[PDB]
Paper text:
Reduction of c-Myc levels has been demonstrated following treatment with degraders independently targeting both [name]/EP30026−31 and [name].32−42 Here, we pursued a strategy of targeting c-Myc through [name] degradation of both [name]/[name] and [name], via the small-molecule inhibitor [name]-[name] 1(43). The latter inhibits [name] and [name]/[name] with micromolar potency and was deemed to be a suitable candidate to assess whether a [name] degradation approach would offer a synergistic benefit in the reduction of c-Myc, compared to inhibition or degradation of the proteins individually. We sought to rationalize the different affinities and ubiquitination patterns through the cocrystallization of representative degraders with [name] and the evaluation of the binding modes. Several high-resolution crystal structures (1.1–1.9 Å) of [name]-degrader complexes were determined.
Residue numbers in the entry: 42 to 166
Write the structure that this text describes.
Amino acid sequence: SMNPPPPETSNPNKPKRQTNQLQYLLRVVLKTLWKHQFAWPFQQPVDAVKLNLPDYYKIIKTPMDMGTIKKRLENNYYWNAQECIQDFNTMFTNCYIYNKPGDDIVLMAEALEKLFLQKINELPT
Ligand code: NA
Ligand code: NA
Ligand code: NA
């Protein structure tokens, strides 16, 4: 019923680098979604306490959010684009698992995911 600690956004042992693809993921993908009108619920870890959702972290064991993603990218936490794309996918999957089809938050996620897939289509090959 507490929130869990947030996902780590830096690790002193994990190697860093910034690929052209990782730059694109921060400067195009993350930024386009971050600025979207529906972005706020996804801009930080789900606060199950403030939202009064005591079963959220009983159901969702791999939480992820764009604030974590953004910090990870800003910190060169990822080694490759696939790691970061996986975190976006996890973020969307979590929302669909926990919520019902037709919920406002699911419609918001579906909107962001459509934009995400469109921008990943232009990831530098
Ligand atoms: Na570039
Ligand atoms: Na996805
Ligand atoms: Na569900």
